[PDB]
Amino acid sequence: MSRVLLCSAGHSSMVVPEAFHAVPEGFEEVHVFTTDSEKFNPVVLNDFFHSLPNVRFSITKCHGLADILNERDFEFYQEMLWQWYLTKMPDNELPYVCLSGGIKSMSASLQKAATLFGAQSVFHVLADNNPRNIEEMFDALQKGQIHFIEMGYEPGWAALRRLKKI
Amino acid sequence: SRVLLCSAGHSSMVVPEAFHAVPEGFEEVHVFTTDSEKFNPVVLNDFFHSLPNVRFSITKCHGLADILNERDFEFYQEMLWQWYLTKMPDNELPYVCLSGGIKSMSASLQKAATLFGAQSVFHVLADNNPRNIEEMFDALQKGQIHFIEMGYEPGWAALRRLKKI
């Protein structure tokens, strides 16, 4: 059984190296849903998981969306997010979800998917001085200056999880 | 009565934007903020005094300046859900704006709605980050502020009776 980590990442890609450490045992899968904004930095994350090859790592770009700016873009975003969530979800398990990255309209639609499709532990990650690279986040992990905010198990809907068959 | 409930933090201007993103206006407004120093109540009040046909009530979380660890969020959350059940109408469901505050302020106000009900969980989005009143009324006027509703949350009457303990 696979402890899977689902995330939304924005410009600040450092949030994913911080959500993988916030669960002590570790993780198996790590999937990241981001926009096709050129401000997304794939490099900070492809250096980090290339030192953990026991972690099946993935990044989905929503081709053709960059900045959610009006009502149609969010209707286009929410739907694309909600699809990605059912697929990357494990088949025998609820996933671990991180609400930290992106903009606020990215993160509240992700709260709804976890409540609608289930989530082992919806959680939020806070930091004291905002680490910008891997050393900063490693030495700030070392002095106890990253706290993990848990929000609680989400039972979801077994019926609504069958939607990935259609 | 249509009620508007808003988390607020550093950028105060989300609340007068949330006021105008519902065409008819609001009779009540209630803000739930920490006792931060950065929270500027002055721009809000200056707007909400020019509109004397409304009832405005900020409620400062007395003691909390910032949420930093899992203990400070659980103080925040429990004080938020009382206030959400305090300021909720008796017969109608409130309008909830997830625009101000931090992300754990908004995801908990998010939950609050789903547990108790919310006529409309919405989230106001702008373009240039309006710094003041004249800028916002010019933003509203050039068609740059966006009302992103997210959905009616019917809530649970079996949990709304909980205000009576």
Numbering used by the authors:
A (entry chain C): 1 to 166
B (entry chain A): 2 to 166
The article reads:
In order to identify novel CARF effectors, we used Foldseek18 to search for proteins with structural homology to CARF domain of the Cam1 effector. This method rendered a 600-residue protein containing an N-terminal CARF domain followed by a linker region and a C-terminal adenosine deaminase (ADA) domain, with accession number HAJ98955.1 from an unknown Bacteriodales bacterium (hereafter named CRISPR-associated deaminase, CRISPR-associated adenosine deaminase 1 [Cad1]), for which homologs were already identified in a previous bioinformatic screen. cad1 is located immediately downstream the cas10-csm genes of a type III-A CRISPR locus. Further analysis of cad1 homologs showed that over 70% associate in genomes containing type III systems (mostly belonging to the A and B subtypes) and exist within many unique phyla of bacteria. These data suggest that Cad1 is a widespread effector in type III CRISPR-Cas systems. Altogether, these data demonstrate that Cad1 deaminates ATP molecules to ITP through the formation of an hexameric complex that requires a Mg+2 or Mn+2 cofactor and an activating cA4 or cA6 ligand. While the triggering of a growth arrest in the host is a common strategy of all CARF effectors, we believe that Cad1 introduces a new mode of defense for CRISPR-Cas systems that couples nucleotide deamination activity to a sequence-specific, RNA-guided adaptive immune response.
Next, we used X-ray crystallography to elucidate the molecular details of cOA interactions with Cad1’s CARF domain. We first solved the crystal structure of apo-Cad1-CARF-His6 at 3.6 Å resolution. The structure showed an asymmetric unit composed of a tetramer formed by crystal packing between two Cad1-CARF-His6 dimers in which monomers are arranged in a pseudo-2-fold symmetry. Consistent with these results, SECMALS analysis of Cad1-CARF-His6 showed the formation a stable dimer in solution. Analysis of the electrostatic potential revealed the presence of a positively charged pocket that harbors both K104 residues on top of the C-terminal legs (residues 104–117) on each of the CARF monomers at the dimeric interface. Although both cOA ligands were fully accommodated in the electropositive pocket of apo Cad1-CARF-His6, they affected differently the angle between the two C-terminal legs of the CARF monomers. While cA6 binding produced a minor change (from 58° in the apo structure to 55°), cA4 binding opened this angle to 76°, most likely a consequence of the deep burial of cA4 within the pocket.
